[PDB]
Amino acid sequence: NWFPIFNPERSDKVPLKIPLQRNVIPSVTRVLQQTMTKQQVFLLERWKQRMILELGEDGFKEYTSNVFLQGKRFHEALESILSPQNLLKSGYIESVQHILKDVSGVRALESAVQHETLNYIGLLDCVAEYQGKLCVIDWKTSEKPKPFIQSTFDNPLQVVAYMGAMNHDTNYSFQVQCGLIVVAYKDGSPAHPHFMDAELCSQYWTKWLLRLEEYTEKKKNQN
DNA sequence: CAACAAC
């Protein structure tokens, strides 16, 4: 019951600088967000200026908050739909009805992955079968249509980062060789599923590894 | 905390 502040088994009579693991092992989000191309940074900055001019500085902050909240709500609704036992009325949930009918055999939900040797961590949405094929599934709300996998920006990199980590994480006894990005729409129009077979996942894996090396090179130029 | 999105 008792927790001592001192440790009488020790004595009390270059300095140690022990790294904090959570600070030196990045999340997938952090790696991707800190290594965007100058062109993507430009497009996002030009869009943000247009939004601030249209909405005002506080209006844009509120827009940004609402985009995040809508996404979090969608994922909360999905977590309860995908688990064994007002949130479920949204247009996004309507958007993915035809996808959900092909999803089965859920094996992980909002579950931590850590790559033992590439030193990154993440939290995946979902591992489940889509039309019988076991997938890391990345569910995404989106304001604009994303009818091609190339319309999804870094989403395929997030998918393969989770696959590679999960496949080399001793907390998991199975491997996953396919990915799926599901883009859902607020007006209820049919969601776009972008399936990634093993070949396509291996192609994006190369690109993810480059982003991870860019992040690593960026952090040692900061030290 | 990560992921939650924006192009």
Numbering used by the authors: 99 to 111, 119 to 190, 199 to 336
What do the authors report?
As revealed by the structural superposition, binding of ssDNA2 has no obvious impact on the conformation of the helical arch, but it causes significant conformational changes to the β3–α5 connecting loop. Like A5, the phosphate group of C6 also forms four direct H-bonds with HsMGME1, via the NE2 atom of His180, the OD1 atom of Asp238, the NZ atom of Lys253, and the NE2 atom of Gln271. The backbone of ssDNA2 is severely bent in-between C6 and A7, resulting in an almost perpendicular orientation between the nucleobases of C6 and A7. Surprisingly, though 10 mM CaCl2 was included in the crystallization sample, no Ca2+ was bound at the active site of the HsMGME1-ssDNA2 complex. The NE2 atom of His180 forms one strong H-bond (2.7 Å) with the backbone O atom of Trp252 in the HsMGME1–ssDNA2 structure; compared to the HsMGME1–Mn2+ structure, the Trp252–Lys253 amide plane was tilted about 20° in the HsMGME1-ssDNA2 structure. Structural superposition showed that the C-terminal residues are partially overlapped with the DNA substrate; to avoid their potential conflict with DNA, the C-terminal region is shifted away from the active site and completely disordered in HsMGME1–ssDNA2 and all other HsMGME1–DNA complex structures.
MGME1 (also known as DDK1) is a highly conserved, mitochondria-specific DNase. Human MGME1 (HsMGME1) protein is composed of 344 amino acids and belongs to the PD-(D/E)XK nuclease superfamily. However, in contrast to DNA2 (2–5) and many other mitochondrial DNases, MGME1 can cleave various types of DNA substrates with a preference for single-stranded DNAs (ssDNA). Structural analysis and comparison suggest that MGME1 follows a two-cation-assisted catalytic mechanism of substrate cleavage.
